[PDB]
Amino acid sequence: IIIATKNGKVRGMQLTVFGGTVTAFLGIPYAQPPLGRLRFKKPQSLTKWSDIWNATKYANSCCQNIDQSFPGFHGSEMWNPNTDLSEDCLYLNVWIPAPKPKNATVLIWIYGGGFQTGTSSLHVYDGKFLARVERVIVVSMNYRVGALGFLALPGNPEAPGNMGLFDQQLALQWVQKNIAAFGGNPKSVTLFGESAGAASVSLHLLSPGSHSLFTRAILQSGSFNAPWAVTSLYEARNRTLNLAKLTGCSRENETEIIKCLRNKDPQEILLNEAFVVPYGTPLSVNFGPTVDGDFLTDMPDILLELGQFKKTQILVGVNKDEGTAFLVYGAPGFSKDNNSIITRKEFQEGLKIFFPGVSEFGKESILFHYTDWVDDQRPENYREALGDVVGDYNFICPALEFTKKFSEWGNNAFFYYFEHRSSKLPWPEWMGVMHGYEIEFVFGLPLERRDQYTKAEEILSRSIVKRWANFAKYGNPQETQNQSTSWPVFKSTEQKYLTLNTESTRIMTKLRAQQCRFWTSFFPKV
Ligand SMILES: *[C@@H]1O[C@H](CO[C@H]2O[C@@H](C)[C@@H](O)[C@@H](O)[C@@H]2O)[C@@H](O[C@@H]2O[C@H](CO)[C@@H](O)[C@H](O)[C@H]2NC(C)=O)[C@H](O)[C@H]1NC(C)=O
Ligand SMILES: *[C@@H]1O[C@H](CO[C@H]2O[C@@H](C)[C@@H](O)[C@@H](O)[C@@H]2O)[C@@H](O)[C@H](O)[C@H]1NC(C)=O
Ligand SMILES: Nc1c2c(nc3cc(Cl)ccc13)C[C@@H]1CC(CC[NH3+])=C[C@H]2C1
Ligand SMILES: *[C@@H]1O[C@H](CO)[C@@H](O)[C@H](O)[C@H]1NC(C)=O
Ligand SMILES: *[C@@H]1O[C@H](CO)[C@@H](O)[C@H](O)[C@H]1NC(C)=O
Ligand SMILES: *[C@@H]1O[C@H](CO)[C@@H](O)[C@H](O)[C@H]1NC(C)=O
Ligand SMILES: *[C@@H]1O[C@H](CO)[C@@H](O)[C@H](O)[C@H]1NC(C)=O
Ligand SMILES: [Br-]
Ligand SMILES: [Cl-]
Ligand SMILES: [Cl-]
Ligand SMILES: [Cl-]
Ligand SMILES: [Cl-]
């Protein structure tokens, strides 16, 4: 089975899924390998090839530092790359239903990883289930991360910043030019991603170069107005110059620094990426999106506030316990192997870890707002409070503020609150409904009865898969057949959202009302 693209013929492989067939094209190149003189530059378009590219396996993952905090632990190694690391990594994957669809809606996945790590070949991003069940076309791409994808000396075309975002954008360009040959509809393309991938998706709503490359957007546990999402240009310059000094590349002529870094081998850059920031936190984004004046023409907060974004429908949501995952990466008294019951003192030292450059009054304000106990006696109180502090500040409240600002300019928005803890979650119970563990349900992994998800989890995954596909195809995330509850539009006034759980489903209003008033209105003033 062979498909002719604008740059050459590609050969896929047939897969058996749920008694049916899905055709997979793994590892299709979409740019020149950013090697040598092309390192740190924007991605270059492909040149023709006369042969047949055998797109039969996942391609290389981009260079990145691997999470080594828990060796042998599936809870952390599930996120580590499962293919070879290489600078030659800008490839994409396409899952098409069998037989070839006529005009199928396309879903483009942008993985997360704090803009430092990630790859499209992860088991939990396997798009064959969605292609099998909803007969949509799933596309995922690899984009450069870390310094190799986001180092910025702005205005300098040798290292202008946002290369990884331009990598994603060139992949969307590829879908627009080629997906029709796979039976796809280039006019029905929905981007979706998680965490830094969701922040990437939200930035594509702002980028002028991305306006006509997709139709709708889904933002899972992330948005560009999150505190970790966008680095200022003065911060980007210091961290670029800091990396230069650590590698012996400090030159006067800024163009010379880049060429020096272009001749350091990738691992010297990787080992030094960690030390470019002096005030580290578990949510530190060493090299990330900047206002480059090309992909991003202005400060994203300004464009969001004044309505300069693509007018379309969005699907946004968060998980119940977004913050717990980061506590075991620095917070004192916390561990994945005990119940992490902390004292008031350890809670306060935890605030210093996550809010290092915040005044003493600002941290007393955080403490005051998160210690109005329902029950004074619960030993879990400070443990769960710091989890809620990290989760609301870094994910939930930014996501809610984005959805409210976006809907204020007339577009339909839908907000969800995912609150089911996976029965196969390798992390301890106290970490709850963790950041990143709605992804398996979105991609339909519980529909595979071979894994021992509950039957309730298969039903929940089946319903979420239908809502996601219905949003991509029709702009409305309803599940109309099985007498579900209707998902109402999120409006700036009432602010309704939908809970996703195995037990029931409810329409609620004003999620984290008191908490997000503090983080979004008051806390920026301290
Ligand atoms: C939950 O575990 C943390 C960390 O536990 C690590 O430290 C070992 C001493 C051992 O307990 C093992 O479980 C693990 O490798 C506990 O915090 C630690 O407490 C000790 C003193 O008791 C300090 O010296 C450590 O620096 C400190 N580590 C961290 C990361 O804070 C914590 O006490 C424990 N909680 C409960 C309720 O048991
Ligand atoms: C600008 O850079 C200054 C130098 O960074 C060094 O700081 C050390 C503490 C260590 O991290 C070295 O690896 C760095 O090279 C730093 O002191 C300033 O604070 C920076 N200013 C800002 C605003 O970030
Ligand atoms: N800096 C980050 C990292 C990751 N995600 C992040 C998510 C956010 Cl919102 C912010 C920063 C992140 C995923 C990887 C894991 C870790 C742990 C390293 N032991 C640091 C990197 C790499
Ligand atoms: C591609 O795969 C086919 C089938 O496995 C194989 O016969 C062929 O030699 C491979 N290489 C090509 C076509 O260059
Ligand atoms: C796919 O749908 C679009 C409208 O969304 C239409 O313009 C186009 O002709 C269709 N292509 C087909 C049916 O091949
Ligand atoms: C830096 O060097 C490049 C090439 O070596 C040159 O084109 C550029 O003008 C130099 N910059 C300055 C400020 O001289
Ligand atoms: C609706 O329920 C039936 C059986 O109860 C199930 O087979 C089907 O997959 C469900 N559909 C959705 C969209 O959940
Ligand atoms: Br992440
Ligand atoms: Cl940061
Ligand atoms: Cl809650
Ligand atoms: Cl107390
Ligand atoms: Cl329901």
Q: Which of 121, 195, 210, 340 is catalytic?
A: 195
For residues 105 and 248, give the distance between their C-alpha atoms in angstroms, rounded to a whole number: 49
Cα–Cα–Cα angle for 145, 148, 151, nearest 5°?
95
The answer on whether 79 is annotated among ligand-binding residues is yes
What is the Å distance from ligand 12's center to 206 Cα? 34
Identity of the residue numbered 310: K
Report the nearest atom of ligand 2 relative to the CA of 277: 11
Torsion angle of the four alpha carbons 386, 391, 393, 394, in this order, in degrees rounded to the nearest 10: 130
CA dihedral sign of residues 248, 254, 259, 261: positive
For residues 88 and 287, give the distance between their C-alpha atoms in angstroms, rounded to a whole number: 19
Structure tokens at 191: 């981007």
For residues 402 and 32, give the distance between their C-alpha atoms in angstroms, rounded to a whole number: 35
- Residue 64 · residue 145 · CB < 8 Å: yes
**Cβ-proximal residues to 252 (8 Å cutoff; 6+ apart), any chain:** none
Q: How many CB atoms lie within 10 A of CB 101?
A: 17
Q: How many CB atoms lie within 10 A of CB 43?
A: 23
Let me know if 74 is a catalytic residue.
no
- Residue 333 · residue 346 · CB < 8 Å: yes
The answer on whether 149 is annotated among ligand-binding residues is no
Pocket of ligand 7 (CB under 6 A): 462-463, 466, 479, 481-482
What domains are defined for the chain? 1-526 (3.40.50.1820)
Resolution (angstroms) equals 2.4
Closest among 414, 463, 407 to 438, alpha carbons compared: 463
What is the Å distance from ligand 4's center to 104 Cα? 28
The answer on whether 211 is annotated among ligand-binding residues is no
Ligand 2 binding pocket includes 275 (Cβ within 6 Å): yes
Q: 């909803």: which residue's tokens?
A: 134
For residues 173 and 139, give the distance between their C-alpha atoms in angstroms, rounded to a whole number: 12
What is the Å distance from ligand 8's center to 447 Cα? 24
Structure tokens at 442: 């979105």
Let me know if 322 is a catalytic residue.
yes
- Residue 48 · residue 10 · CB < 8 Å: no
Beta-strand (E) ranges in 301-404? 314-319
Q: How many CB atoms lie within 10 A of CB 122?
A: 21
Let me know if 45 is a catalytic residue.
no
The answer on whether 114 is annotated among ligand-binding residues is yes
Ligand with the closest atom to the CA of 320: 10
Q: Whose CA is nearest to atom 3 of ligand 6?
A: 255
For residues 144 and 298, give the distance between their C-alpha atoms in angstroms, rounded to a whole number: 22
Closest among 476, 515, 510, 516 to 492, alpha carbons compared: 510
For residues 471 and 314, give the distance between their C-alpha atoms in angstroms, rounded to a whole number: 9
Closest among 282, 310, 468, 490 to 401, alpha carbons compared: 490
Closest among 238, 335, 343, 312 to 474, alpha carbons compared: 312
What is the SS3 string spanning 15-63? Answer: EEECCEEEEEEEEEECCCCCCHHHCCCCCCCCCCCCCEEECECCCCECC
For residues 464 and 17, give the distance between their C-alpha atoms in angstroms, rounded to a whole number: 19
Structure tokens at 478: 């309803």
For residues 224 and 204, give the distance between their C-alpha atoms in angstroms, rounded to a whole number: 10
Closest among 337, 419, 341, 421 to 380, alpha carbons compared: 341
Q: Which of 369, 422, 435, 458 is catalytic?
A: 435
Identity of the residue numbered 48: K
Residue length of the chain: 526
Beta bridge partner(s), residue 508: 497
Running DSSP on this structure, what letter comes out for residue 144? Answer: -
Beta bridge partner(s), residue 56: 26
For residues 284 and 196, give the distance between their C-alpha atoms in angstroms, rounded to a whole number: 12
Ligand 2 binding pocket includes 250 (Cβ within 6 Å): no
For residues 418 and 265, give the distance between their C-alpha atoms in angstroms, rounded to a whole number: 42
Burial of 80 by CB count in 10 Å (0-12 exposed, 13-18 middle, 19+ buried)? middle
Closest among 442, 437, 432 to 471, alpha carbons compared: 442
Closest among 433, 361, 438 to 391, alpha carbons compared: 433
Beta-strand (E) ranges in 161-243? 184-194, 216-220
